[PDB]
């Protein structure tokens, strides 16, 4: 009953040494610059994450003109807030509605919109989620505590190409006149993948 293939299994005992050995090699040959690599790590550890997508969502909730721009051109839309780049070059925003619930997956690997959500969590990239999301989305969402009404369509989007998807979740009731910042606080990572809903006040 250990973790085996869910993404959270224990790595090999010697993995850190293996990693160091390769790193020393690549630095010795002059293939990589350690100082630049630290900047990449800092970028994904501290600067890029789901707080970015949350701002995008909050703005769309309060500004119908922005929402329309965002739905017409996802890349240009997220760029209005200064988000862009690697693994988000061609963005498509998926609007949830009373009729449609959107959720995305990469069945073939791990593709995910880094500029607005940061690096994916381990579960998103592992076999259980990837295998089952396209065949039994309701069963998977239920494991997250999310039960979609039987009469609501679920659209699962498989990220098999170089388009990247982000879900624009539905604004919760009870949030009249909330500032963008207060709205943003309700917007979870899960709500932008489609595996959850925004926090209800």
């Amino acid at each position: 009953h250990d973790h085996h293939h869910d993404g959270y299994q224990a790595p090999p005992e010697d993995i850190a040494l293996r990693v160091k050995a390769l790193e020393s090699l690549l630095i010795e040959k002059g293939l990589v610059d350690p100082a630049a690599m630290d900047l990449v790590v800092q970028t994904y550890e501290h600067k890029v994450g789901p707080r970015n997508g949350a701002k995008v969502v909050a703005k769309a909730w309060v500004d119908p003109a922005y929402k329309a721009r965002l739905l017409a051109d996802g890349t240009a839309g997220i760029a209005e807030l200064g988000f862009s780049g690697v693994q988000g070059e061609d963005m498509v925003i998926l609007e949830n509605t009373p009729a449609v619930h959107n959720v995305f997956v990469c069945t073939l690997c791990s593709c995910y919109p880094w500029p607005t959500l940061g690096l994916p969590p381990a579960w998103y990239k592992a076999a259980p989620y990837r295998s089952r999301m396209v065949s039994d989305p309701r069963g998977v969402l239920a494991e997250f505590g999310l039960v979609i009404p039987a009469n609501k369509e679920i659209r699962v989007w498989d990220t098999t190409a170089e388009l990247r998807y982000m879900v624009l979740p539905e604004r919760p009731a009870g949030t009249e006149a909330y500032s963008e910042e207060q709205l943003a606080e309700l917007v979870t990572r899960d709500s932008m993948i489609g595996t959850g809903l925004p926090t209800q006040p």
Partner: protein, 219 residues
């Protein structure tokens, strides 16, 4: 490639376990492995299609047992040898053959600009679109041993073009030194019943997949 990575529709992988408050990096070695990718892509040591297909070719058990960044580590240790950037000896020993014989392309001064810009796979010109939104199309039954982005679960199945995204590089050729052969990519919508049959389906649900023009034929 009909390998273990093509997971859609598979049974037996179990519950979606999720760690509460998961950090971006769970181990320090993951930081190193992750940051290597942009560094090596910047050098032009391999492209992303080649990177994906290197992972696809790792052993099936190795793929299942290894945590995510172990997949990446596999590519660095193997694809760099196949490309002739490193030797198998260098990799095994961890010792370079002959000093700093290269200069890093990814330097501190360009990290931010490079990460903020990325590299779109969109291209200006390519094969003309054969399909329009609303068209019924069938995914061709193909079974290449090399790299492809038509999942096994879609092959032979009938769906509806719902978006034409424009022209993109074709991974099937770009991963194998055969050029970009740019063509249109469409989002295709399949019903649950069409993919999984009457018993395993729900009447409301649909699955959208992004497929290249020549993966398809008129239904």
């Amino acid at each position: 490639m009909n390998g273990i990575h093509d997971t859609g529709g598979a049974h037996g992988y179990g519950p979606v376990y999720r760690e509460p408050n998961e950090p971006v990096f769970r181990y320090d070695w993951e930081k190193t492995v992750m940051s290597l990718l942009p560094a090596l892509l910047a050098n032009g040591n391999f492209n992303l299609d080649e990177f994906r297909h290197s992972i696809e070719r790792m052993g099936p058990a190795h793929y299942l047992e290894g945590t995510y960044y172990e997949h990446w580590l596999h590519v660095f240790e193997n694809l760099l040898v196949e490309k002739g950037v490193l030797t198998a000896t260098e990799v095994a020993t961890g010792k370079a053959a002959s000093g700093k014989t290269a200069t890093p392309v990814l330097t501190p001064a360009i990290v931010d600009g490079l990460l903020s810009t990325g590299a779109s796979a969109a291209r200006e010109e390519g094969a003309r679109a054969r399909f329009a939104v609303g068209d019924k199309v069938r995914v061709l039954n193909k079974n290449p041993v090399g790299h492809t982005r038509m999942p096994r679960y879609t092959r032979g199945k009938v769906g509806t073009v719902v978006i034409d995204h424009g022209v993109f590089v074709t991974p099937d050729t770009a991963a194998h030194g055969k050029g970009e052969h740019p063509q249109h990519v469409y989002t295709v919508s399949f019903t649950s019943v069409e993919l999984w049959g009457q018993d395993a389906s729900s009447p409301k649900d649909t699955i959208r997949v992004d497929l290249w023009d020549d993966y398809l034929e008129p239904a």
